[PDB]
């Protein structure tokens, strides 16, 4: 995650362990969402992916989550069309839906958007998409 | 500039800001270095293919960096169209962004050149190996500086800057 000068740190194993704990023990409970929010303060898209990917099993649930993420990524692209460069000094290219989801963007790009003045909080945007997906999964049970 | 040649095509833009004339920009295109990219730009100036820069605008201007235009389809940076298609490949990166008054292709990454272009306002080495430089402003940099004054750091323009006339000399 990004911690405040804003500096990057890799995700903590303790954060991953706490997420795996709540997913395993209290599966499909509403309280998975607040625990996800509690454990993802300043998280990059990379961090969020690492959290989600650490869980073994629940692959049908992950597939649903992935489908929700793809819908929100496509919705981002629908509302944010790409503009041609060149990129000015000290500026970032526009993030696409797949960049926010941590698929096509580098860690350095993710850090760049999150710590820019003004920032594009790609970590927070992706978090909203994930929480939407988690809500769907909980809703059907 | 030692890349200049008498046989290179010379083209021009007459530019206006909300109807107020700003003057003529005269550009030489490096056909001797990048003939394919130069030919696209030349044809778009004359409009001989049935489309071109006539009545296009400078939709994005970042002072001390670039004056950008050539979005002949969407007029906002999301569009563009070349004589070879809506995309064509990067020809070469021989000519570098060494100073102001250079013509360089705008793009959205590798091999996505169309009609969008930039006139440089400063040396921009960070564009080297990414944008194809294909010409320079031979005369009328004063007009380019007038365009610059209507820009902002984020690229927004405070006047409608239209290429009211263009062609080949």
Residue numbers in the entry:
A (entry chain D): 1 to 4, 9 to 145
B (entry chain A): -4 to 164
Question: Which text from the study accompanies this structure?
Answer:
Recent studies have shown that the nuclear pore protein NUP358 contains a C-terminal cyclophilin domain (NUP358Cyp) that interacts with the capsid of HIV-1. The lentiviral capsid protein differs from its gammaretrovirus counterpart in that it has an extra loop between helices 4 and 5 of its N-terminal domain (CAN), called the CypA-binding loop. The cyclophilin A-binding loop is so-called because it is the site of interaction with the cellular isomerase, cyclophilin A (CypA). NUP358 is a large, multidomain protein that forms the cytoplasmic filaments of the vertebrate nuclear pore complex.
To determine how NUP358Cyp binds HIV-1 we solved the X-ray crystal structure of HIV-1 CAN in complex with NUP358Cyp at 1.95 Å resolution (see Additional file 1 for data collection and refinement statistics). As observed for the recently published structure of uncomplexed NUP358Cyp, despite the sequence variation between CypA and NUP358Cyp, the structures of the two cyclophilins are remarkably similar (Cα atoms show an r.m.s.d of 0.5 Å). The slot-like binding site found in CypA is preserved in NUP358Cyp and the complex of HIV-1 CAN with NUP358Cyp has a similar quaternary arrangement to the CypA complex. The CypA-binding loop of HIV-1 CAN projects down into NUP358Cyp and mediates almost all direct interactions. In comparison to CypA, NUP358Cyp has residues with bulkier side-chains at the capsid interface, such as K117 and D59 (A117 and G59 in CypA), resulting in a more extended active site surface. This is reflected in a larger buried surface area in the NUP358Cyp:HIV-1 CAN complex (610 Å) compared to CypA:HIV-1 CAN (420 Å). For instance, the carbonyl of I91 in CAN makes an important hydrogen bond interaction with CypA via the pyrrole ring of W121 and with NUP358Cyp via the imidazole side chain of H121. An important hydrogen bond interaction in both NUP358Cyp and CypA occurs between the side-chain of CAN H87 and the peptide oxygen of residue 71 in the cyclophilins. Analysis of the HIV-1 CAN:NUP358Cyp structure reveals that residue 61 is located at the center of the binding site, almost directly under CAN P90. The conservation of R55 positioning and its proximity to CAN P90 suggested to us that R55 may hydrogen bond with the peptide oxygen of P90 and lower the activation energy for cis-trans prolyl isomerization.
